[PDB]
Amino acid sequence: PQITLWKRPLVTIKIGGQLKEALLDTGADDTVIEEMSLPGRWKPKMIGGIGGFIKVRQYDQIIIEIAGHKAIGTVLVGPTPVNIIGRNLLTQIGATLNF
């Protein structure tokens, strides 16, 4: 698809058997999802942005479906205000910025 940016670029994702709404975020290096459980091992990480840092759990090799397109990669889980699909997964679905 071609998504214009008059409004927030929200899409439906499937992660851990759950449907969620998430923001396609070119300014995010990583993918950060609100608290949920995911299977497998994880390790703690700190990520920072406007407002400062939050502690998250880093899960590797997690499959997501993003607007119908499957990807795999690292997902960070923690107290993010918004679910964010960052570049680590946007690349996998072939997303580009065009102007």
Ligand X SMILES: COC(=O)N[C@@H]1CO[C@@H]2C[C@H](OC(=O)N[C@@H](Cc3ccccc3)[C@H](O)CN(CC(C)C)S(=O)(=O)c3ccc(OC)cc3)C[C@H]12
Spatial distance between the Cα atoms of 82 and 23, rounded to a whole number of angstroms: 7
Catalytic residue status for 25 = yes
Of residues 38 and 67, the one with the C-beta less far from its own copies: 67
Q: Under the criterion CB under 5 A, does residue 8 sit at the interface with Cl ion?
A: yes
Tokens 């998250």: give the residue: 56
Residues of span 3-42 touching its own copies by CB under 8 A: 3-6, 8-9, 23-29, 32
Of residues 49 and 68, the one with the C-beta less far from ligand X: 49
Spatial distance between the Cα atoms of 32 and 75, rounded to a whole number of angstroms: 6
* Helix, strand, or coil (residue 9): coil
Q: Under the criterion CB under 5 A, does residue 58 sit at the interface with Cl ion?
A: no
11, 13, 24, 30: residue in contact with ligand X (rule CB under 6 A)? 30
Breaks in the chain listed by the residue before each, with C–N > 2.5 Å: none
Catalytic residue numbers read 25
